[PDB]
Ligand binder design. Structure first.
Ligand SMILES: CC1CC(O)(O)CC(O)(O)C1
Ligand SMILES: [Zn+2]
Ligand SMILES: [Zn+2]
Ligand SMILES: [Zn+2]
Ligand SMILES: [Zn+2]
Lengths: 327, 339
């Protein structure tokens, strides 16, 4: 019936148009509190995120899923503040991303399961805010620790019904190994979104996963360093494929019959400290629409390609609701 | 005369505010309340039982050290070692033991630090010394840095940023070494290329090595020698591989006799001693704090209760031991003039 957000539980019908892979701030544990001047100030970051989320709201977005984990610097009090002041629901995440500190990397699968369950069932830190999704990551073949995280995420999902969403190196087909580990724990593919799947052009990789029941996260549509070819760091992070190429993978999976399993997002942020210093300004300079890019640019592009309204509403409303509802 | 006056004079920053140099007293220069990771104590306090259990454990431990004569500890936990200065302030008030907090970076920096330039790191260290840590207003009184063998390129940047922050603020620098790889020599070279005075640098974990020529060469150059892990020993724990790997096979007596050896060779003024103890420990294996507590129940009181009597009956005068534990830290922690 209910999805946990940073403002409390909401009914499934209240989620509406939902972006399923977003960030208020991509950082590191403790960093925003220790060095807020990196972002100008905490107050400036709040103002920027509220302005950006209000723009997405005006474009039709009603909910975002912030898939920042502990080690990506999730500050759930920031999420709550920005959610309240933009009147946009925010679902918070547990799990671990690609930068776990020693106090996490030394933990057993049983210990990690307890930590994920704490954030889902009890709350994050001392805030009482409960996570509504579990985030995990690989970058190619899983490290031994990442195998533990994937298993703990599966166990936490089985205990609570909250879904699992993943970071992949899509061009190394990471979703296949993630799926194998999840299924070895008894997790239903319908509880799993294989993310960053628009980073690859290998449609056969994506359709094979979708034919097994997985959700496919086409979540980085505006990420492109076209026009930034003299910028090595932006090119390495954003890639040289266009947003149109990424968006046409949405149409391709629709055309192949998988509209009920597509999840679309921007993978945008309003602050970004875990990469080179200038990256947030560079990213903003090529996508000023920010999180409004999906509703303002991708939807009109697909509609004029012939995707009907019912299909676009199915992808942006029905699929996230089915995914997020604890099952 | 001025050794006796506590109601006025120059001051050092603690988690409870500024104190005069004379108030510092018996000072342990390398300790931890909790060895963790950034944000970890707040995200998963049940790892330590509870935050309140950790507080009570630390307060009892500090009171034990205080009854043994300790008046001040330097908590050399950085941001990435999970320093929680609000925890430090709470336990300092409850135990009435002064705590100096640290800036710098240790061996587990996150991406948001690893990607930063020397200039950016300099600004972060200056923020924590000149403005305060997080939103607490508590100012760091020492800069902590680390190598584990030959420095990585990032570790070099950290050492240079530490030196620049030290010159700009007057606060001293203290280091983590892999002592058997002679890390202090490369650290010294980098520090000296930045113009930092050796008398403002403690080369830490120096009791992990038996190579006296390495230590006396650094002390002869004016460096402070941190003999800071005296009770760390896995003797009796040989079937415990994780405890053996962390604590080593050398006895506390062997470590303590390095203190006497440096005294005997004329380097008393260059020695700093400590326990490198903690009351919570999450950045290693799960059982490690209970294991460590089982072989050193005295905790931070090990230096006053065990090392001082051992050295005294070996003929080290009381006044020499008081110079090492009171005067030497006072000179180290007292800020010098800014550049
Ligand atoms: C925090 C984000 C930054 C990014 O560049 O969008 C990649 C990511 O893996 O989604 C994590
Ligand atoms: Zn990702
Ligand atoms: Zn992301
Ligand atoms: Zn150390
Ligand atoms: Zn230490």
């Amino acid at each position: 019936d209910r999805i946990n957000t940073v403002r409390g539980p909401i009914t499934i019908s209240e989620a509406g148009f939902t972006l399923t892979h977003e960030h208020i701030c991509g950082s590191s544990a403790g960093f925003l509190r220790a060095w807020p001047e990196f972002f100008g100030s905490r107050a400036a970051l709040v103002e920027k995120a509220v302005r950006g989320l209000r723009r997405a709201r005006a474009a039709g977005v009603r909910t975002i899923v912030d898939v920042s984990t502990f080690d990506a610097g999730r500050d759930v009090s920031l999420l709550a503040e920005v959610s309240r002041a933009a009147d946009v629901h925010i679902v918070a995440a547990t799990g671990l991303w690609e930068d776990p500190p020693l106090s996490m990397r030394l933990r057993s699968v049983e210990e990690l399961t307890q930590f994920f369950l704490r954030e889902i069932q009890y709350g994050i830190e001392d805030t009482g805010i409960r996570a509504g999704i579990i985030k995990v990551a690989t970058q190619g073949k899983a490290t031994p620790f990442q195998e533990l995280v994937l298993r703990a995420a599966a166990r936490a999902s089985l205990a609570t019904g909250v879904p699992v969403t993943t970071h992949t190196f899509a061009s190394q087909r990471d979703g296949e190994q993630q799926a194998a580990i999840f299924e070895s724990e008894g997790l239903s593919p319908s509880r799993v979104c294989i993310g960053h799947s628009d980073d690859t052009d290998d449609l056969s990789y994506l359709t094979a996963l979708a034919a097994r029941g997985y959700l496919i996260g086409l979540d980085g549509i505006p990420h492109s360093a076209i026009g930034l070819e003299d910028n090595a760091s932006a090119s390495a992070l954003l890639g040289n494929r266009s947003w149109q190429t990424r968006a046409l993978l949405i149409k391709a999976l629709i055309d192949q019959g998988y509209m009920k399993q597509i999840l679309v997002s921007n993978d945008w942020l309003f602050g970004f400290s875990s990469y080179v210093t200038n990256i947030m300004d560079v990213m903003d300079s090529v996508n000023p629409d920010g999180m409004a890019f999906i509703p303002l640019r991708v939807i009109p592009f697909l509609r004029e390609k012939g995707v009907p309204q019912e299909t676009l509403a199915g992808i942006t409303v029905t699929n996230p609701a089915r995914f997020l509802s604890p099952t």
